[PDB]
Design a protein around this ligand. Structure first.
Ligand SMILES: *Cc1c(COP(=O)(O)O)cnc(C)c1O
Ligand SMILES: *Cc1c(COP(=O)(O)O)cnc(C)c1O
Lengths: 397, 397
């Protein structure tokens, strides 16, 4: 039947579980005390595998805004943004994004996945081009699949291939170059300055995703593009509420005069309910605090540098030479080594994000650590000691 | 540039606004007192254009569950369901759905749109078939577009065309027939008993969307399929948290033994954050109350019958001869008549959902009313008096 196609995946899963490893796709956070602490399988555990970069999910102002919105506006809107679903707090969250990015336009979607799906498929039509990194987020590829444009993949992280591929396209048709500021798999940074220069040389519009940089890159926390001096040069910035902001939702911001007309045509905007009042209320409060959360930014980067430096010095192969983001990826030689490390860490009281094929390319096996502004120095050292113990026991170092 | 394609839509919008009508796509609920009352443009307004069918968004148990989850688990998970994003309340909401539908399997997505997008594109692959009503929800079509299957549209509401089109397909390949229990545009009901019999005659699996029926059709509130005696015959049921349940989210339930393996392969499940703790907590509480909300069900149907009967008797052309759902669609002769009615109702203190092309087919112009369990008899009569006044002033009756 229709599910027979999953027999291989089912057998692969059972093979993994035959090794005695905890099912990595069924972890449950039974309790979550803070941004950095949970209870998993009854064990107190340090969280080092979340995108709660700025610790906003337990910020007292954020929590209070959510509770107040539940009380005042109820649990949901029961309507789309095109009909009855735009409440006070939806207007507030779009304004918060305008203020955060310094843009005249802001369109909020129910998820980041849907923002990418919708904006890519709506902006570029038949006879037009979407140009993207080969290893772009699934939602960006799904946006391409949803639309009718010509898709132009370029070699991962290659300014040269972007330039050459763009240069061979016909000059007249409109073009969208889609870039990510931070590459989430290894936690390295895109050469946006150089790539945007190339895009503009070829007359393309540019969309940059700043999901993994929000609140901690650039003077205003706007992202890698801001840090690299590209303010005013980026046509569209896409992002999410599910990482630094600490809830769910997606968005696109722009200064283009016709931008908010996208609402009239964008299927993933139109054909879904708007977000719950409490979600857009917590997002508004969080976004506004993220404009100036300097103490948190400082702690986040201090923690990232300490973890990155410590793991590198201990003998782990890292995805990056220098600490360039809040993701630190440990690279292992094979799937077994990654699973054994991950299990030892878990059993010892530490959660990190394992990544193996097909999540990663064949031959790449990772423990992806992500830092929080609210990790303490003691926690980061506890983590390093845990990696030392696990690495020695498993034979990685 | 990329936005020049919207010049026509922008001109169309300005033409509409030149008539002096309030922008129907920019309505803001400044305050929302209850499921049935809001403040719009500073005016106290009865809401008669929401999908809050069972009034659950202000249920005190629902609200309390959301507040408690914010306090205990924070504003968001900052991770996917495949990694760090499955908290206690995510497991709770999936179990609530199992209990609600009497199924062994339940997979929750971040929106109903994404549940349809994902389940359709993941279940049916190359060489297989998705068979759907010509006027299916956008998300169902988008699921088809996202996948690699052969798409087979059948004439709207035609058991005969479903049968004939299915019969011409090759017998061996697996097939998914996708049906909706309630047709949302006019509020009529699908002939599921007959269509499912046809699907099974041709050996197809069946997916039914019960978004517009949840909690008020069938003995257990499971939907039109349950009301029509099809318990145990439906392979997959898809739904949403954004209507009766009163928050955001999507889901698919099934008794198929391999079903939850869908999680391993479904892109809109994998590549997005899980829902906020408060969202899955309010949904759990709401879903469980909806299993036995008999007083509300009774009120909802009483209100629907009173509104449907009243509008019909007053001389409005309705989308349905009998009151078959909680949607009552008033059909107007042209766009101007619909807009004038909608504006008169709005100015007089009533919000309904206008629908004009391209939301509707060319030549169809609607005021779509939707009933709530928490509308009072006085409110329903107030609404009827408002329709009488508006209809007389505009010249519709
Ligand atoms: C996180 C992320 C997304 C998805 O965001 P959600 O809001 O979790 O759906 C999409 N694209 C990129 C580049 C991301 O980093
Ligand atoms: C409401 C509805 C959807 C979308 O649900 P959301 O949760 O609002 O995204 C999808 N399909 C059908 C048939 C619906 O009725």
């Amino acid at each position: 039947d229709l599910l027979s196609k999953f027999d291989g995946l089912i057998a692969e899963r059972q093979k993994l579980l035959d090794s005695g490893v905890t099912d990595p796709f069924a972890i449950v956070m039974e309790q979550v005390k803070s941004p950095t602490e949970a209870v998993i399988r009854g064990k107190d555990t340090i969280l080092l595998g979340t995108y709660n970069y700025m610790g906003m999910t337990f910020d007292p102002d954020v929590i209070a805004a959510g509770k107040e919105a539940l009380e005042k506006f109820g649990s949901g809107t029961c309507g789309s943004r095109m009909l009855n679903g735009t409440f006070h707090d939806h207007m507030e969250v779009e304004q918060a994004l305008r203020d955060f990015y310094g843009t005249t336009g802001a369109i909020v979607f129910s998820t980041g996945y849907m923002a990418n799906l919708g904006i890519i498929s709506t902006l570029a039509g038949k006879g037009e081009y979407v140009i993207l990194d080969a290893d772009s987020h699934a939602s960006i590829y799904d946006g391409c699949q949803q639309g009718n444009a010509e898709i132009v993949r370029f070699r991962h992280n290659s300014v040269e291939d972007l330039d050459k591929r763009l240069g061979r396209l016909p000059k007249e048709p409109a073009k969208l170059v889609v870039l990510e500021g931070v590459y989430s798999m290894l936690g390295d940074i895109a050469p946006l300055k150089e790539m945007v220069a190339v895009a503009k040389k070829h007359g393309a519009m540019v969309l940059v995703d700043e999901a993994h940089s929000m609140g901690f890159f650039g003077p205003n926390g706007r992202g890698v593009y801001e840090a690299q001096g590209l303010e005013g040069q980026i046509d569209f910035v896409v992002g999410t509420f599910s990482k630094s902001v600490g809830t769910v939702g997606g968005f696109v911001v722009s200064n283009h005069p016709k931008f908010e007309a996208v609402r009239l045509a964008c299927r993933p905007y139109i054909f879904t309910a708007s977000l719950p009042p409490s979600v857009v209320a917590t997002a508004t409060t969080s976004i506004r605090k993220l404009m100036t959360a300097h103490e948190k930014r400082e702690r986040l980067w201090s923690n990232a540098r300490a973890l990155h430096g410590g793991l590198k010095a201990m003998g782990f192969r890292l995805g990056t030479e220098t600490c360039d983001s809040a993701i630190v990826a440990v690279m292992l030689e094979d799937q077994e080594q990654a699973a054994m490390m991950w299990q030892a860490l878990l059993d010892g009281g530490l959660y990190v994000n394992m990544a193996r094929p097909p999540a990663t390319p064949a031959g790449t096996f990772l423990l992806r650590c992500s830092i929080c502004a609210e990790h303490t120095p003691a926690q980061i050292q506890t983590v390093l000691g845990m990696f030392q113990a696990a690495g020695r026991a498993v034979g990685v170092i």
